[PDB]
Design a protein around this nucleic acid. Structure first.
Lengths: 226, 111
RNA sequence: CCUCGA
DNA sequence: TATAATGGGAGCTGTCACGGATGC
DNA sequence: GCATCCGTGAGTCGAGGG
């Protein structure tokens, strides 16, 4: 496998003669492909948190939970999501969508969830007071693809509804594998805090798993078809 | 074919850890480390080659290697782990020698 | 091996 | 015993008649 | 059935020189 280009099939998978394992690699036989020295290990760490959002009651779609990509609400006119606390803004951007956490001193005082179709109007570290607009919702707003809404609690207040969402998603972290190291964990294995992923010559260069996640192996040095 | 840096380092690592696993199998079994090494080696290569090793106190024949391999298969899972480590070490050692056999020619042509 | 002799 | 080292090298050919395998 | 490559034989006794 040339440097930088990735695999077009997965470790452990059956392959047929002539099936391409990569843009420049065609397998001459049939069988199980195996990875030889993946140079990049991507750990998807799973996160279960609780966030909140306020929306006009006319726009909302009542639902007990929200699958990824499912419509959360539909807005006839531009809406301004406003801060309901004061503090400093920690902006955490996902692939699509965002989390916005307000902190006063050390303890976070608010956790908001901006789905797709909601443009944050604040910067990381920004100081916000109550009623200050944190985002603009326009048109249809939907759940992002990477994150799903386990449970939905709602409260009606005035002409708006406020959602407390129990969200569950995963975030990527990549680790570059040096040749003298070796991956001691399979594909799709579940790891916890302290578990070893990739060993090495000396302890300070080892790859330990920070939190709970799943493992994915990419960019193998070569592919062994057996 | 010739070994790349990664393949070479991997095979050498497997050899090191397999020798360590043989030492651990000697610790657990109370058996002789050399007899353990010869049984793991014997099963790796095949019944084609099992002979009497000079240093061994016991004649090495398929009966004794079968008895010893069954004593090595009768241990707990975490004590059976080292048997697999040693087998992999033997196979890595074989492939390492065979992959480096061209260097011997390139050096011996000078003598 | 060679050269020489019969 | 630790830089890395990874497929050789010598190679003139002026006979002839036999059995026997090897091929077309 | 008939070309072709491989192997095995091709005087003795001397002497010397090595």
């Amino acid at each position: 496998l040339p440097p930088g280009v990735d695999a077009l099939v997965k470790d452990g998978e059956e392959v047929v003669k002539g099936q391409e394992l990569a843009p420049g690699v065609v397998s001459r036989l049939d069988g199980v492909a195996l990875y030889r020295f993946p140079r990049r290990v991507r750990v998807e760490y799973v996160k279960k948190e609780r966030a909140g959002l306020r929306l006009p009651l006319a726009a909302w779609v009542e639902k007990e939970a929200y699958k990824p990509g499912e419509i959360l609400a539909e807005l006839p006119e531009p809406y301004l999501f406003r801060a309901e606390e004061e503090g400093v803004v920690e902006l955490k951007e996902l692939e699509e969508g965002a989390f916005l956490v307000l902190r006063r001193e050390d303890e976070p005082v608010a956790t908001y969830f901006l789905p797709v179709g909601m443009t944050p109007l604040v910067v990381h570290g920004e100081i916000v007071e109550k009623g200050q607009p944190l985002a603009e919702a326009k048109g249809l707003l939907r759940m992002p693809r990477q994150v799903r809404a386990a449970q939905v609690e709602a409260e009606e207040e005035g002409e708006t509804v406020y959602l407390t969402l129990f969200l569950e998603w995963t975030e990527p972290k990549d680790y570059r594998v040096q040749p003298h190291m070796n991956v001691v964990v399979p594909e799709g294995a579940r790891v916890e805090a302290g578990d070893k992923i990739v060993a090495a010559i000396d302890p300070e260069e080892e790859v330990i798993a920070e939190a709970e996640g799943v493992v994915h192996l990419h960019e193998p040095a070569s592919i062994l078809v057996v | 074919p010739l070994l790349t840096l990664e393949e070479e380092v991997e095979l050498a690592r497997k050899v090191e850890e397999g020798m360590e696993a043989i030492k651990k199998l000697s610790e657990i079994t109370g058996l002789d480390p050399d007899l353990i090494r010869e049984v793991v080696r014997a099963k790796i290569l095949g019944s084609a080659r099992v002979r009497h090793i000079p240093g061994l106190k016991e004649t090495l024949d398929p009966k004794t290697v079968e008895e010893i391999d069954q004593k090595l298969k009768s241990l707990p899972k975490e004590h059976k782990r080292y048997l697999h480590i040693a087998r992999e070490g033997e196979a890595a050692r074989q492939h390492l020698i065979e992959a480096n056999l061209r260097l011997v020619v390139s050096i011996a042509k000078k003598y």
